[PDB]
């Protein structure tokens, strides 16, 4: 009982955290390029 | 063109010791006047208005490139949400 029910826990922990690692990249990479866009608009605002 | 002057010339000799009432003479050069040449100041043809035109044309040309770069960089947020959402769904399939 404890063999197969604990073996799948490794893959469960891997998948339920790979689901969140992509979300973190989704959020962290959007609030950084927006700074690039704001800087570009600021540079144009200098002109 | 001669400046008006009532008096012609006067004379009581120049003893170096007896200098009194220290006035100052008009100091003149020793060269004939003809080469003390004429006053000329010439303008730069590029006018205060003309530099405005040139630099405004440059500003308007640079603004187009700035907008091109912005529109090139404005599509990256669309790329992130177009590429990562299918990957998140594929991970969810497991």
Swiss-Prot record, chain A:
User: How would you describe the post-translational modification of this protein?
Assistant: Proteolytically processed, possibly into several polypeptides. Enzymatic activity is only detectable following cleavage of the UL36 protein, which occurs late during viral replication.
Subcellular localization, as worded in the UniProt entry: Virion tegument; Host cytoplasm; Host nucleus
Q: What is the annotated quaternary arrangement, including any partners?
A: Interacts with host CUL1 and CUL4A; these interactions inhibit the E3 ligase activity of cullins. Interacts with inner tegument protein. Interacts with capsid vertex specific component CVC2. Interacts with the major capsid protein/MCP. Interacts with VP16; this interaction is important for outer tegument association to the capsid. May form homodimers.
- Into which family does the record put it? Belongs to the herpesviridae large tegument protein family.
Its annotated function is as follows: Large tegument protein that plays multiple roles in the viral cycle. During viral entry, remains associated with the capsid while most of the tegument is detached and participates in the capsid transport toward the host nucleus. Plays a role in the routing of the capsid at the nuclear pore complex and subsequent uncoating. Within the host nucleus, acts as a deneddylase and promotes the degradation of nuclear CRLs (cullin-RING ubiquitin ligases) and thereby stabilizes nuclear CRL substrates, while cytoplasmic CRLs remain unaffected.
- Could you identify this protein by its name? Large tegument protein deneddylase
Q: What is the lineage of its organism?
A: Viruses, Duplodnaviria, Heunggongvirae, Peploviricota, Herviviricetes
* Part of the full-length chain shown: 3117 to 3163 of 3164
Curated annotation (Swiss-Prot), chain B:
The family annotation for this protein states:
Belongs to the herpesviridae CVC2 protein family.
User: Which region ranges are annotated with the description Interaction with major capsid protein/MCP?
Assistant: 1-49, 1-50
Which proteins does it associate with, and in what oligomeric form?
Heterodimerizes with CVC1. Interacts with major capsid protein/MCP and triplex capsid protein 1/TRX1 at the pentamer vertices. Interacts with the large tegument protein/LTP. Interacts with host NUP214; this interaction might be essential to the capsid docking to the host nuclear pore. Interacts with host TMEM250.
The record's function comment reads: Capsid vertex-specific component that plays a role during viral DNA encapsidation, assuring correct genome cleavage and presumably stabilizing capsids that contain full-length viral genomes. Participates in the interaction between the capsid and the tegument through interaction with the large tegument protein/LTP. May mediate the capsid docking to the nuclear pore allowing entry of the viral genome into the host nucleus through binding to host nucleoporins NUP214.
- Name of the featured protein: Capsid vertex component 2
Q: Which residues of the full protein are shown?
A: 1 to 94 of 580
The taxonomic lineage of its organism, from the top, reads:
Viruses, Duplodnaviria, Heunggongvirae, Peploviricota, Herviviricetes
Q: Where in the cell is it found?
A: Virion; Host nucleus
């Amino acid at each position: 009982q404890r063999t197969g029910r604990s073996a799948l826990a490794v893959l469960i922990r891997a998948c339920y955290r790979l689901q969140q690692q992509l979300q973190r990249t989704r959020r962290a990479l959007l609030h950084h390029s927006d700074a690039v866009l704001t800087s570009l608009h600021h540079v144009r605002m200098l002109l | 063109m001669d400046p008006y002057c009532p008096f012609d010339a006067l004379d009581v000799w120049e003893h170096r010791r007896f200098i009194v009432a220290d006035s100052r003479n008009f100091i003149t050069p020793e060269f004939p006047r003809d080469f003390w040449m004429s006053p000329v100041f010439n303008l730069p043809r590029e006018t205060a208005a003309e530099q405005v035109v040139v630099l405004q044309a440059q500003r308007t040309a640079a603004a187009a490139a700035l907008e091109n770069a912005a529109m090139q960089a404005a599509e990256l947020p669309v790329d992130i949400e177009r590429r990562l959402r299918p990957i998140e769904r594929n991970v969810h399939e497991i």
